[PDB]
C-alpha cells in the first residue's frame, strides 16, 4: 500500500553526481592508461557487471586503485562514467566504437544495445 | 546532444538497495534508541538535509556510528530509510505522525509535504 515519489531516483542520482564532482566519499580511482577517474564503488557496481564482479571479490573489494585493460580508451570510459552518474550518454560518430567496446568490457548491456542499433542504422 | 536511458536512475537505486540488503559496502550504522540500521553515507546524504550536513562535516564524515535524537521513532526511521533506497513510502494512519516528525528531523521536504497533505485531508 506504499505511495511513490516519481522523481526520487533521479534526485538521488543527481546528488550522487554532485558528490562525485566535489570528490566527497569517493573510495576508488579507476586508472585507464594515463588517466585517473575517482568514483564511488557502490555506483560503479550498480551500473556495471564488471565492477559488480570486482567489488564483490573478497580481495579486490578493499583496493583503492583499479587498473583497466590497456586497450580501454579513456574518453570512452569518461563518457560511460558520466552516463553512470547521470543517465545521459554522449554518443557521437567519433566516439561510438570506443563507447561500445568500453560498454562491452564494463558489461553495460543497455549501452551496448543502443550502440549496436546506432551502428546498424549507419551501414 | 546526449541520449538518455529512462530507467537508469531507478535501476541504480534498485542495485543500491540490493547492496544494502546484502550489507555490501555499508559504511555507517544509524542508532535510533535500541535499534541499528546499516546504510551507505552517500545515499543518506543524497536523500536527507540532516545527513548531508553531518557527512560534509570534517569530523563527523569519518564516524562509523551516528546516534539520532532519542525522540526519533525507530519504525519512522525504518520507513524513511526504505523510502531513501526505493522511492516507496509505507505511509499509514498508525505511523503518519512518526513518519512526518522523522522526515522533519531528517530534512526530507517532499515526505514532510505529503504527510502534511494526508493529515490535512483527515481533519
Amino acid at each position: 500500500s506504499c505511495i511513490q515519489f516519481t522523481r526520487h531516483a533521479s534526485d538521488v542520482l543527481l546528488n550522487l553526481n554532485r558528490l562525485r564532482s566535489r570528490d566527497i566519499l569517493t573510495d576508488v580511482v579507476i586508472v585507464v592508461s594515463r588517466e585517473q577517474f575517482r568514483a564511488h564503488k557502490t555506483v560503479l557496481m550498480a551500473c556495471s557487471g564488471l565492477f559488480y564482479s570486482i567489488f564483490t571479490d573478497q580481495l579486490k573489494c578493499n583496493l583503492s586503485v583499479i587498473n583497466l585493460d590497456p586497450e580501454i580508451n579513456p574518453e570512452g570510459f569518461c563518457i560511460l562514467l558520466d552516463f553512470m552518474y547521470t543517465s545521459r550518454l554522449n554518443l557521437r560518430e567519433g566516439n561510438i566504437m570506443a563507447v561500445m567496446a568500453t560498454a562491452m568490457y564494463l558489461q553495460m548491456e543497455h549501452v551496448v544495445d543502443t550502440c549496436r542499433k546506432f551502428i546498424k542504422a549507419s551501414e | 546532444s546526449c541520449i538518455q536511458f529512462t530507467r537508469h536512475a531507478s535501476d541504480v537505486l534498485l542495485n543500491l538497495n540490493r547492496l544494502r540488503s546484502r550489507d555490501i559496502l555499508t559504511d555507517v550504522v544509524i542508532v535510533v534508541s535500541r535499534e541499528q540500521f546499516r546504510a551507505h553515507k552517500t545515499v543518506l546524504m543524497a536523500c536527507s538535509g540532516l545527513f548531508y550536513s553531518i557527512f560534509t562535516d570534517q569530523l563527523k564524515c569519518n564516524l562509523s556510528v551516528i546516534n539520532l535524537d532519542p525522540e526519533i521513532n525507530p519504525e519512522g526511521f525504518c520507513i524513511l530509510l526504505d523510502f531513501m533506497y526505493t522511492s516507496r513510502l509505507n505511509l499509514r494512519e498508525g505511523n503518519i505522525m512518526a513518519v512526518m516528525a522523522t522526515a522533519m528531523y531528517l530534512q526530507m521536504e517532499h515526505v514532510v509535504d505529503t504527510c502534511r497533505k494526508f493529515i490535512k485531508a483527515s481533519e
Binding site: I3, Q4, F5, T6 | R88, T114
Partner: peptide, 4 residues
C-alpha cells in the same frame, strides 16, 4: 507522489 503516485500510486505505483
Amino acid at each position: 507522489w503516485v500510486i505505483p
